[model samples]
Target: PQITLWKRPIVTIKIGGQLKEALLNTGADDTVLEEVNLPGRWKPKLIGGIGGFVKVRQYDQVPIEICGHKVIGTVLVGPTPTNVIGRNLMTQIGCTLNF
Candidate 1:
């Protein structure tokens, strides 16, 4: 399926057994969620970007469904503006650029 890139590129996704709206951020290396209760072992990681660095709880083997495509991997939970689907999950869903 072809995905049209929007100005914000926001999409609906299911994460942690809950529906959520996430931004398709190609520039982001990892997926970041605003806030969620994940029961497991996670490490506190400090990630840096244009918005400076933020400490996040990094959890592995996180399962998520993006645009009807199922993807499971790492997801960072922190104080973000919104949930983000990065290249890690994008490539698995076979998303590409087409203008």
Candidate 2:
């Protein structure tokens, strides 16, 4: 295995031509794709929060490219993300949280 010094690449992912950079948080448990330009052909479900369960879905497949690597995801829908790329993503990308 390549011994990388940096845990997470800490890159700027472009969603809908907007840049979300320097966001190193990995506490979230679910991948959140939302707010704008959500994909089509997604599956909707119910999500729970302080307010209770709400409806959500995946409308498209998203491909996330970071540091020249890519992670294709099922386009999640409803209640778009403010900030979240959960464990499901970190693990698949061959990484873990540093702290």
Candidate 3:
């Protein structure tokens, strides 16, 4: 299915038994979440942004539901301005962009 990109193409996602709004950011390589309460093993990662670098915890194979579609992969939790659904999960949803 095709969806027109709005000023901010925000979508609803189910994570950690709660609904979260995230942007479908093709520019981002990995998914970043504001914060979540999933207790699994995580690896420390330093993510760089416009401001600077912020530390984050990356957990692999985390399940998330987007627009009724189920996807599972790496999800980073930390201090993020907004939740982002990156390319890793985009491919799973067959997302395409047209200018």
Candidate 3 clash pair list = none
| Model 2 deviation from the true structure expressed as Cα RMSD, one decimal place | 4.9
TM-score of structure candidate 3: 0.92
Model 1, residue 90: C-alpha shift (Å): 0.5
Per-residue alpha-carbon lDDT of candidate 3 for residues 1-99, written as tens digits (9 for 90 to 100): 556765788889999889878999998889999978985899999989888899999999999998669999889989998899999998898888877
lDDT of 2 by residue, 1-99 (tens): 333445653555656555564333465455665555644466766666656775767544577654345766543446743545656555666766343
lDDT of 1 by residue, 1-99 (tens): 556654778889887678889989998889999888775899889988887999999998877889978888889999988788888889898887766
Best by lDDT: 3
lDDT for model 3: 0.88
Q: Candidate 1: global Cα-lDDT?
A: 0.85
Q: Alpha-carbon error at 19 in model 1, in Å?
A: 0.7
Rank candidates by lDDT, best first.
Answer: 3, 1, 2
- For candidate 2, the 10 contiguous residues with the lowest summed lDDT are 1-10
Q: What is the lDDT of residue 17 in candidate 1?
A: 78
Clashes of each: 0, 10, 0
- Better model by TM-score: candidate 2 vs candidate 3: 3
